[PDB]
Amino acid sequence: SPQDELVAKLSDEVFSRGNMHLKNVDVVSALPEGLHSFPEVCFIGKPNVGKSSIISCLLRNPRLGRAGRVRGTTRLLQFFNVGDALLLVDTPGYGGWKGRHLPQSVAERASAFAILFRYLALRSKGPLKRVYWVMEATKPVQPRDEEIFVFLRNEQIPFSIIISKLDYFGGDGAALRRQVESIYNFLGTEDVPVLGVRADSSRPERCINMTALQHDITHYCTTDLVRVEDLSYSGLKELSYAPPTFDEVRAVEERYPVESFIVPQDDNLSLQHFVSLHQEAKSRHLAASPMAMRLSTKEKLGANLIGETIRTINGVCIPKSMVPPSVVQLAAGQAGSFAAFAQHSGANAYEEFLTGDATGSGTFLEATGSEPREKSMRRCALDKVLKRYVACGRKQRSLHMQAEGYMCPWLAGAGQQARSAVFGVTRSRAHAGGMEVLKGLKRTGFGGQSYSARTMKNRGRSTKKTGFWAA
Amino acid sequence: YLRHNATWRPLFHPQTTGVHGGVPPRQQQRVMDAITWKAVCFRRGLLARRKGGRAKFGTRAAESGVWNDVGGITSRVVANMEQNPHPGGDDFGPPRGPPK
Amino acid sequence: PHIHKYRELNRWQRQAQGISKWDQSHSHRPLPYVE
């Protein structure tokens, strides 16, 4: 075929130049958008299905793509830049991580799933060119796979299916046909593309149908190109995308909160049964605990025991008692988010003031004695030195805001100009959206600051010019 | 109170104030010696608490095990780690299987 | 004359802020560019 031979020579030329690990993403703000805005391709699936093994086999390096028998090896989006023209996104496994005993397991898992689903829902229009749902060879359909398909059909994201563990069939064409038949029965579509391929980065001879995957991902990465000059290697490197707008990134974070990503330890109980077991066990504990009967129904509402509403991927509600406090501290700790900004500027000024006034000695009381000798000045001076120069304890600083927009939101300094600056064109009025296609951003950038957050070293309080205590 | 609010305290060599801060460096050396000593002692404790247990030895407790279990050289290899039925070689003793 | 910025700061102010001696501007170490 004319186009198939051109994309084949392109995929070979791009991948033959080498690759490297670009950036790991845990927060929605720190994304490769900027000078590193390549067309991206992600591989999602349940834990221990071969996602990182396929990445390591495509990248031709076993040590680069870290894979292991224990689940939970990948706990955040791993961006791999192949040939300086494409991005391969390695995603965390959606399911129960057995054998992984990392501290703060609930918070680390909730952060892993939050960045996963919010990245897919946001950049589905670009530069995420194709989503690959990696499923195990003979593993049946589980509620985790149901949650994935519900998320995809609600966001209207086209996805391809990769059946890994191809050696499990051992050349059984009949079993593979029944496996894809079970997939087509659960999905409900015959035209969904499915590619079965195993990956062994240790020995190249064990790999089968693996060179066809890099040709496939290049096909979906170049489908945006229109001209044959763009289909060339220079046209793909010039292809870049625009950053998301504030309105669409705020909507996806509101619909998909960090507290909603709480999955069971097993992979057989659905989210409905997992939240029902919490309700049943909590109702029994209240009716059995004597101190629980000492509380009032209004106090239980304040303690979120008897009881906006957090909806999961499937659309089921989770009570506030189900969310552990480690996750709440996680969302408020994530930099560049509304929760972290709300913690700094005050979540509830009237409520926080009365709370702080009650927990302290008083709003106007100073140097009071509750109903020995005080610390000497020579001690306070010594304690201040040990805190500042040894323990490295520092004070908080302020957060800045655009003055031109904060004073008046409906001016041109804030943006969102409905006018058309370009005159004499007919295609600009039709082309719109939060993320558009801009050619050559990798070499030109926006102008001034182009890298996103958490990209450069020694920024902000971590400057190496004046030392730590100077801040 | 009279030392900090009512006493004229001259400076030491105001020509080179931007170097020694107006304080005799012999007094500064005595002050720095005391602060550095107390800073090192507080640091040794903080480093031992961060790394766990002791600073140099870490979580390796003195009562549990040996500090350095490599005196001179140690051979990581283990004899017959493959657990093969016949480790004598490809051909050794009785012949295995019919010839040709 | 001088072209640096910290020349208005004396040695005491430099060591109090925590700044390295700008007179010993070493360039054999490259800057941490995003490779």
């Binding site: 030195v385 120069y389 030392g467 | 801060g21 007094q27 500064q28 002050v31 720095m32 | 005491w12 109090a16």
Partner: peptide, 7 residues
């Protein structure tokens, strides 16, 4: 560790 001249 680094401690500046305090006095």
């Amino acid at each position: 560790i680094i401690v500046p001249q305090q006095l």
